[PDB]
Design a protein around this nucleic acid. Structure first.
Ligand SMILES: [Ca+2]
Ligand SMILES: [Ca+2]
Length: 134
RNA sequence: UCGACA
DNA sequence: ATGTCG
């Protein structure tokens, strides 16, 4: 019955408002050790943050030759990564430039690299808050 | 239009 | 509010 794979990486987004200030980080699911944390972005959506978090985790694991899976509680982000396309509705303008810039580069990375990293759904309703929660 | 879920 | 799905 979906055992928690503790040998994995968990990521999550943190924000102040939605859309609003967004940041994300990845931790060791087992210990909670923070493996990476993104500098806050002035304005972005929760989902863009969830999305960027997985893609960065994907890059973090690849460059370290790790086959560990990644846990995300975002149904949306998980699909965006699966499709290699972040279907965000956030308006594109001077204010949202940076976030979209990161989202586009994330998509670009996905479309130019390969990986076998399993992207798993973290079940908050059963296991509590994802370990990388803010 | 109605809702379900993350 | 952001998103997917029927
Ligand atoms: Ca989350
Ligand atoms: Ca959270």
């Amino acid at each position: 019955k979906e055992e928690i794979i503790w040998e994995s990486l968990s990521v999550d987004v943190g924000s102040q408002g939605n859309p609003g200030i967004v940041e994300y980080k990845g931790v060791d699911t087992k210990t909670g050790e923070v493996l990476f944390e993104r500098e806050p972005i002035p304005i972005g959506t929760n989902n863009m943050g969830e999305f960027l978090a997985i893609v960065h985790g994907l890059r973090y694991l690849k460059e370290r030759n790790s086959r560990k899976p990644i846990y995300s509680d975002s149904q949306t982000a998980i699909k965006w990564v699966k499709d290699k396309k972040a279907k965000s509705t956030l308006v594109r303008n001077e204010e949202t430039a940076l976030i979209w810039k990161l989202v586009d580069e994330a998509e670009e990375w996905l479309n130019t690299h390969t990986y076998e990293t399993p992207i798993l759904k973290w079940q908050t309703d059963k296991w509590g808050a994802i370990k990388a929660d803010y």
